């Protein structure tokens, strides 16, 4: 039972249980059913809350369909993984991640006038190794001026702070001039394209290093989990996993009437069907109706 | 794929590269007389110029049937490829069963023989736990929720430190 | 029975999606 705002998110979605709900909804609209009125109310706080809790319903079936490139050599499966995350973010309603984190920056420090409270209100959304390297530059400009350097653009203190911050940015490894000349725009399409290609080269290396860092975290977690598991004798492993499986079954079995409980138990029935169907003919895979 | 593709009978592969399957076409004006041989079965048919264009009309859309999910199966495949790297060094364990005879029992120190039998039981423990392969599907669900809540971001699923740092330069170094 | 479907078998199984649906159903009327 789709609620006319959930189905508007699943129209461009490409996973299974959302598209099946859309197909049932569109076959309902084929059999002479009216579409509900889309509600033009619920001022912007509830709007962004519904967007936040509705793009998660498109992201969460979409992450579990995206295979990690674990243990792979090369930047081609890492780029496959980051591209699938990009297509998932675009299906769920997000924009480019550059644009979305710039929007988070502009939404965070819209009412801050000093650079120090910009660095203290965008603290979570930047790395600590970069926030410290900006805080020391800000402290040096505070030693040079002995007055709070304001975040205006026409204030000259911000200019002599940014002239060091560009050197900080290029010494971190990211070309600040290429990024600024992309996101400012250019005169003709040739000198705009000449910096668009270089910003997309940096951006490709940026999200590829991001996905590679995520995959190295999952690889280290899998190695630590296995090396802690291979130190146990087998009976301890079997009783621990039967205890975990039974306790997480009964955590869904006590709660009854909800959608996630029946979906969990229908999924356990589907997993047991998969084990039976691979038992019936194991050299040909599971039986799919075709 | 897109809705309009433009491939077929034009800069196409006309001959095979493998000795296991032997394909050959007849590049005529419009049509093509193919002949394909894969072992003792043979097929030699004819495809029209407007017959490969309608091949990409219906889309295949290959999608995977997994036991739990493609994420969980990829994590479990990695855990199995780690179990193999442990198992390959349990494969190089020196054969202690050649020294079980009583001409090594009564020649050796009592404490060194107790140490040796403890080492053999330790090998049997390591080998019986590295080949508990059905526990990998439960270990792989101890990586799934932390990762899947990492991708449940308020910003973007594909976000990371480098993109946010580059856009923090773009936010800071532009005016206000 | 056996040979279920393909679009029924493309579902990622133990994904959340419904704890999210439960919170979005018990939060949005109560925050409105």
């Amino acid at each position: 039972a789709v609620s006319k705002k959930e189905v508007l998110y699943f129209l461009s979605s490409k996973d299974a249980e959302s598209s099946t709900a859309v197909k049932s909804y569109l076959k309902s609209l084929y059999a002479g059913a009216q579409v509900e009125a889309t509600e033009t109310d619920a001022s912007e706080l509830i709007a962004q809350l519904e967007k936040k809790y509705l793009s998660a319903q498109v992201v969460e079936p979409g992450v579990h369909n995206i295979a990690l490139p674990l243990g792979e050599s090369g930047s081609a499966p890492v780029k496959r993984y980051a591209a699938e995350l990009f297509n998932l973010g675009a299906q769920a309603g997000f924009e480019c991640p550059f644009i979305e984190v710039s929007k988070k920056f502009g939404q965070e420090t819209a009412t801050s006038e000093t650079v120090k409270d910009v660095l203290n209100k965008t603290k979570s959304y930047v790395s600590a190794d970069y926030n410290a390297a900006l805080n020391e530059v800000l402290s040096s400009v505070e030693a040079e001026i002995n007055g709070p350097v304001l975040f205006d653009g026409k204030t000259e203190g911000f200019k002599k702070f940014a002239a060091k911050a560009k050197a900080v940015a290029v010494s971190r490894g990211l070309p600040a001039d290429t990024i600024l000349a992309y996101c400012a725009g250019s005169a003709n399409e040739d000198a705009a394209d000449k910096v668009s290609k270089e910003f997309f080269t940096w951006f490709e290396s940026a999200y590829t290093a991001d996905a590679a860092a995520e995959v190295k975290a999952i690889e280290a977690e899998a190695a630590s989990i296995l090396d802690r598991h291979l130190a146990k004798p087998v009976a301890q492993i079997r009783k621990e996993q039967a205890s975990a499986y039974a306790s997480l079954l009964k955590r869904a079995e006590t709660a009854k009437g909800a959608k996630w409980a029946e979906k969990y138990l229908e999924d356990v029935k589907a997993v047991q069907w998969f084990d039976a169907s691979v038992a019936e003919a194991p050299a040909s895979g599971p039986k799919v109706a075709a | 794929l897109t809705t309009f593709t433009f491939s077929g009978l034009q800069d196409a592969p006309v001959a095979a590269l493998s000795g296991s399957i032997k394909l050959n076409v007849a590049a005529k004006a419009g049509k093509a007389e193919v002949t394909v041989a894969a072992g003792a079965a043979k097929a030699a048919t004819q495809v029209s110029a407007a017959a490969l264009r309608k091949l990409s009309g219906s889309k295949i859309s290959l999608a995977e049937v997994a036991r739990i999910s493609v994420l969980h199966s990829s994590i479990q495949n990695y855990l199995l490829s780690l179990s193999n790297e442990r198992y390959q060094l349990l494969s190089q364990w020196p054969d202690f069963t050649t020294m079980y005879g009583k001409d090594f029992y009564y020649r050796a120190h009592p404490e060194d023989l107790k140490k040796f039998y403890d080492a053999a039981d330790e090998y049997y423990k390591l080998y019986e736990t590295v080949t508990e392969f059905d526990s990998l599907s439960a270990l792989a669900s101890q990586v799934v929720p932390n990762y899947a809540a990492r991708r449940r971001s308020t910003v973007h699923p594909a976000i990371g430190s480098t993109v946010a740092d580059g856009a923090f330069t773009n936010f800071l170094l532009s005016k206000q | 029975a056996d040979a279920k479907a393909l679009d029924e078998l493309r579902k990622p199984k133990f994904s959340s999606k419904y704890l999210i649906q439960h919170v979005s159903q018990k939060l949005i009327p109560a925050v409105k």
């Binding site: 998660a56 790395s127 995520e214 630590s224 | 060094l89 349990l90 929720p145 | 133990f14 959340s16 704890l19």
Partner: peptide, 30 residues
């Protein structure tokens, strides 16, 4: 094989905390 369902969001953007290498290869070679 089944996992605890979590419903929480990650607001901060951190480096993903690459964990330490365990000693299992060294201990089994020993």
């Amino acid at each position: 094989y089944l996992a605890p369902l979590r419903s929480d969001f990650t607001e901060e953007i951190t480096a993903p905390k690459v964990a330490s290498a365990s000693n299992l290869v060294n201990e089994w070679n020993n």
